[PDB]
Subunit: 103 residues, 2 copies
């Protein structure tokens, strides 16, 4: 779990347009694997592989509930792993804010 390993696996995960779309779909709340597979014109096993890549990179969490795997966005992990680089290269356009604190 070394943070350049975590950056690298996060960048490989968001390299793929299907995986980006799965992450956007999860921003509204937890979705079952079957619901995610229902939204894409590729095979269920191809969606399983995409979801395994996202889970491998810490970008989604998994939970079981009967015969169903439900996926949740891990937005804090994504923000740190991609957002440190992006705010480092684009300091005048992109701000990372992990802090709970607000004005």
């Amino acid at each position: 779990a070394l943070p350049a390993d975590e950056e690298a696996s996060a960048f490989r995960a968001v390299a793929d347009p299907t995986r980006r779309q799965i992450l956007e779909d999860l921003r509204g709340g937890e979705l079952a694997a079957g619901e995610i597979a229902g939204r894409f014109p590729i095979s269920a096993p191809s969606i399983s592989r995409h979801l395994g890549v996202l889970k491998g990179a810490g970008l989604v969490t998994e939970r079981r509930d009967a015969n169903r795997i439900l996926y949740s966005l891990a937005e804090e992990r994504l923000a740190l792993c991609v957002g440190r680089f992006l705010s480092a290269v684009c300091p005048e356009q992109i701000v990372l804010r992990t802090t709970k604190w607000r004005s």
Copy 2:
């Protein structure tokens, strides 16, 4: 040039690679010659040209001829929107995009 969705896709395939992210980070300090970029990595000159051509094709660097030498500049506005719209959409609480001052 391309639709925003295609500029987004090409930026994400460019920043997929750790050598390309390191090049973009190195360019943060100002324009560098191809040869200087190549000297910052233990990989072949043809491999650095290939990485630079991928960054150029995604609009994340711009190229300039000064006599016989190619110089590269970071295109930070392009990178910020192509990657930052998605990242601020998925992480609204943690990531703020401002294209403007």
